[PDB]
């Protein structure tokens, strides 16, 4: 139907503070200090994967996302 947006001049992943509850596979669930890498965007509507559950992928609204600077074990 339409193309959506590749999310350019990005930096990698980001952090979730939400108590989103998806209830399908088109969606998916996101809590508080959860951390999720998007892969695409939309303006309030993005696609990606929690660092948790990089098998399962979604969709979240941009309300509550933070993209952030990467981060380091240690």
């Known amino acids: 139907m339409t193309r959506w947006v590749p999310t350019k001049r990005e930096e990698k992943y980001g952090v979730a503070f939400y108590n989103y509850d998806a209830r399908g596979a088109d969606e998916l669930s996101l809590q508080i200090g959860d951390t999720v890498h998007i892969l695409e965007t939309y303006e309030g509507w993005y696609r990606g994967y929690t660092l948790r ?7 979240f609204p941009a309300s509550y996302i933070h993209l952030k600077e990467a981060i380091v074990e240690g």
Request: no cysteine; proline share 0%; hydrophobic share 15%.
């Open 53 to 59: 559950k990089k098998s399962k992928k979604g969709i």
